[PDB]
């Protein structure tokens, strides 16, 4: 949150200042490169032509899109052409579903057999990343943190403090990230070793 | 061969201590009074997870098999027992026809009624205990959960007979009694008196007349 | 049909410098955008280059990186190669043949459209020059075409009347700079006299024919 | 650098059968990618043998079939015949390189059935080669079968140095090679040694045809 290199630290039902005193019962970091306009089909709910075949998202998604330029590493001096983009699919993936694949693409009568041409369009393309390319069209690193906030007991914590343990008195608790406010007693309660 | 799995296959829906009342919610459970498959050698479809059980005294079973093809080139899902450890492997495996690298993850940790569950990120459950399909009511405590995901359609044992049955996405009621386990259960769609007692939150349904349900 | 057909071949120093070309005949080149491709004499075909319609085009650094370039033009339907610093390998027959670059496209595995004819460079310090034929009399008759520049030629003989008893060996360079070879044709030692036995050599390329009737003595 | 590398040469009789390999590495035939092979005798065009590693391309038999795994490709011929003892190369690509990789080359072959004894003789250079005041010779091995001869000739009974070269394919109507050897000398040289003659030897062969093939005859 805060570094001095992310162009963007968009996030959705979290917030990034709140992030840090907070736990997840997983998190996974989906990395990837793009040209920096592409940045606007990396959203929930957007309609993105790219998404849609490379990186989707859901609607109702929680996370954050770390963004970040990254002309300065990534476009060699000799010209970047490293990275593709991924243009035709039958159809829209699911939230999260990658799919590589290596299928020719039919846009109305023709016949392919598995070879392209007019008509016959190879999914993939070189992203051109000069070292001279201007401003929008650069190579921009991403990482979406997607953050699973499950009721499963949580895995991945924010450095919080680790205050000792007060019984019989009225405390305003937080216990794995989930925060009340109570009288806590120690319990005979019999719950078994995995509740 | 074809077999009874009446009462059997429940499981705890989640890791959530609930004493003293009839819970109910929607999962993937094996349908009540619906057919286990029986057997005494072949691989079988991981239709949606799996619930599992065998009774024999030896201790004849090393562990269990899951994947797509289970053979290079994607990676697979194998467990085994050698007596002091259960182990768990997951590679792209050079298994053979008749199994009586780049490995991505690993871990370590009527004689019984040996009852299993499987469901896909990926989660175990059982029972294994002694009681001596079989009758009557138990319910099937968390053993593991996996933090991945794969594409799994393929499922087999490393052994005799065991018994197989795939669960489906069906609401439940559940006992649980004073001391939060589960010791009863309505399977809701099994008939019409089990909606009704799921209707109502109760396994009694005194004398009358209750609407249930509704027809399009 | 991609009916690919090179073109604009070229003979010049060591240390020089040319252009050269080929097209896909009557049919639109933005389908099907090929890289240059040649022989290694002697050996297999030679990694050139590879292309992309973007651009993204990538040179193999054993022979061809800070010499060789590509590009085409849709309104010609030609590629095209500005060529710096000749070297005397490069001397070979260049197909244009096959489109899609490093980066997987058309399927992992490949299919390759259309090999055309050949174009050419060619490299030496020696000149064009007609070939030294003499009757060689010898039947099972033969010729050596010592001393000329530059190959290939047409060889045949009673201007292909005979060609069903011909043989033509291996190649011939002399130190001179120049090239040779050797044709043969076996055919009855008793017709001479009656029975004309003659060898053909078009040569378009050194601007000297030969079309000799031979006998012995 | 990198190369697919193949056999030299796998044999079978007509209608027999054979299948071959072309060699890489990990970085290439292991690299996911697939591998292709040509046909080529010089000047013919290069004929593509396989599409998609499922398929062969427009109108080429099933006698050429591949198959492909670990570091290899193995191409094939089932009904072998004559045509078909040719030059033939393979490609993929290589992760090691920027692009493509090429193979080794591979000759098919017919199977050396006869014991067909070679013709031997050198054809005379004519007294009307003085017209440019120079001579030519090469020694004749035509008409053996199968493989190749011992080059051996002689010039006044001292044994004749360096002059090899690569035997030639199968004739027409038959089976039967060619091959020649090689000499030269300044021209009153030419003249000075005067016993040029050939003295080959073949696995069926027991004496030669040779004449004398003197300077100035
Ligand atoms: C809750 O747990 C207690 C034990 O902690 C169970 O009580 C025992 O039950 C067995 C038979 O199931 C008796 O033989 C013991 O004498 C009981 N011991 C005590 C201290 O009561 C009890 O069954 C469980 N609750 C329910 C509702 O089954
Ligand atoms: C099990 O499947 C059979 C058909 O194989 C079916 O007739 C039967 O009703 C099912 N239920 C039981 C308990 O057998
Ligand atoms: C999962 O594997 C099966 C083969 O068992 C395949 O048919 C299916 O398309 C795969 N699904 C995905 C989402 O990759
Ligand atoms: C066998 O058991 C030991 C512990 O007793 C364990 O370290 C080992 O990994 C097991 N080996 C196999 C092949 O399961």
Redesign the pocket.
């Known amino acids: 949150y805060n570094s001095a290199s992310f162009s963007t630290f968009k996030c959705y039902g979290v917030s990034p200042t709140k992030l840090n005193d907070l736990c997840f019962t997983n998190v996974y970091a989906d990395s990837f490169v793009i040209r920096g306009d592409e940045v606007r089909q990396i959203a929930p709910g957007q309609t993105g032509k790219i998404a849609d075949y490379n990186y989707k998202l859901p609607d109702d998604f929680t996370g954050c899109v770390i963004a970040w330029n990254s002309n300065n590493l990534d476009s060699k001096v000799g010209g970047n052409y490293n990275y593709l983009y991924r243009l035709f699919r039958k159809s829209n993936l699911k939230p999260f579903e990658r799919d590589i694949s290596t299928e020719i693409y039919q846009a109305g009568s023709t016949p392919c057999n598995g070879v392209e041409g007019f008509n016959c369009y190879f999914p993939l393309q070189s992203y051109g990343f000069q070292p001279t390319n201007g401003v929008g069209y650069q190579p921009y690193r991403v990482v979406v943190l997607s953050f699973e906030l499950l009721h499963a007991p949580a895995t991945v914590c924010g450095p919080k403090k680790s205050t000792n343990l007060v019984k019989n008195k009225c405390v305003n608790f937080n216990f794995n990230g989930l925060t009340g406010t109570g009288v806590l007693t120690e319990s005979n309660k019999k719950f078994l070793p995995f509740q | 061969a074809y077999t009874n799995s009446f009462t059997r296959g429940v499981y705890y829906p989640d890791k959530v201590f609930r004493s003293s009342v009839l819970h109910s919610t929607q999962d993937l459970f094996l349908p009540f009074f619906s057919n286990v498959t029986w057997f005494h050698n072949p691989v079988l479809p991981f239709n949606d997870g799996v619930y599992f059980a065998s009774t024999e005294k030896s201790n004849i079973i090393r562990g269990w098999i899951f994947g797509t093809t289970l053979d290079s080139k994607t990676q697979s899902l194998l467990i085994?027992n050698?007596?002091?450890?259960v182990?768990i492997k997951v590679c792209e495996f050079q298994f053979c026809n008749d199994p009586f690298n780049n490995c991505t993850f690993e871990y370590?940790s009527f004689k019984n009624l040996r009852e299993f569950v499987f469901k896909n990120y990926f989660k175990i459950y059982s029972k294994h205990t002694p009681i001596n399909l079989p009758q009557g009511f138990s319910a099937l405590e968390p053993l593991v959960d996996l933090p991945i995901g794969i594409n799994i359609t393929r499922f087999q044992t490393l052994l005799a007979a065991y018994y197989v049955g795939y669960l489906q996405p069906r609401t439940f009621l559940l006992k649980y009694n004073e001391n939060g386990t589960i010791t009863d259960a309505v399977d809701c769609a099994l008939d019409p008196l089990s909606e009704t007692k799921c209707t109502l939150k109760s396994f009694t349904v005194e004398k009358g007349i209750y609407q249930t349900s509704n027809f399009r | 049909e991609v009916q690919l057909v090179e073109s604009g071949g070229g003979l010049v120093q060591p240390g020089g410098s040319l252009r050269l070309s080929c097209a896909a005949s009557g049919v639109t080149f933005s389908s099907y955008w090929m890289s240059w491709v040649r022989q290694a004499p002697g050996k297999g075909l030679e990694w050139v280059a590879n292309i992309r319609q973007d651009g993204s085009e990538k040179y193999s650094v054993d022979s061809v990186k800070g010499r060789f370039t590509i590009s085409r033009d849709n309104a010609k339907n030609s590629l095209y190669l500005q060529m710096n610093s000749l070297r005397a390998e490069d001397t070979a027959v260049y197909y244009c043949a096959r489109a899609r670059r490093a980066d997987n496209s058309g399927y992992y595995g490949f299919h390759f459209d259309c090999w055309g004819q050949g174009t050419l460079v060619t490299v030496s310090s020696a000149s064009t020059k007609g070939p030294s034929v003499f009757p060689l009399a010898p039947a099972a008759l033969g010729c050596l075409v010592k001393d000329y520049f530059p190959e290939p030629v047409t060889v045949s003989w009673n201007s292909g009347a005979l060609t069903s008893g011909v043989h033509t060996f291996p190649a011939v360079l002399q130190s001179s700079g120049l090239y040779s070879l050797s044709s043969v044709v076996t055919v009855p030692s008793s017709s001479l006299g009656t029975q004309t036995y003659i060898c053909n050599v078009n040569h378009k390329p050194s601007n000297t024919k030969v079309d000799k009737k031979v006998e012995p003595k | 650098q990198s190369v697919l590398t193949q056999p030299p040469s796998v044999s079978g009789a007509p209608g027999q059968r054979v299948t071959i390999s072309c060699t890489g590495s990990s970085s290439n035939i292991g690299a996911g990618y697939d591998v292709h092979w040509y046909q080529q005798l010089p000047g013919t065009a290069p004929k593509l043998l396989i599409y998609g590693n499922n398929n062969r391309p427009s109108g080429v038999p099933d006698r050429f079939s591949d198959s492909k795994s670990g570091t290899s490709a193995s191409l094939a011929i089932t009904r072998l015949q004559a045509e078909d003892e040719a030059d033939y190369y393979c490609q993929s690509y290589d992760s090691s390189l920027s692009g493509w990789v090429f193979g080794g080359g591979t000759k098919l072959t017919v199977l050396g059935q006869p014991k067909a004894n070679p013709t031997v003789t050198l054809f005379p250079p004519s007294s009307e080669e003085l017209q440019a005041n120079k001579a030519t010779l090469v020694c004749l091995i035509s008409d053996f079968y199968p493989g190749a001869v011992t080059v051996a000739w002689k010039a006044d009974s001292s044994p004749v140095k360096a002059g090899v070269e690569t035997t030639t394919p199968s004739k027409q109507s038959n089976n039967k090679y060619a091959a020649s050897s090689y000499l030269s000398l300044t021209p009153e040289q030419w003249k000075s040694h005067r016993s040029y003659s050939c003295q080959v030897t073949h696995e069926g062969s027991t004496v030669e045809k040779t004449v004398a093939p003197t300077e100035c005859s």
């Open positions: 085994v050698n007596a002091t450890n182990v370590v």
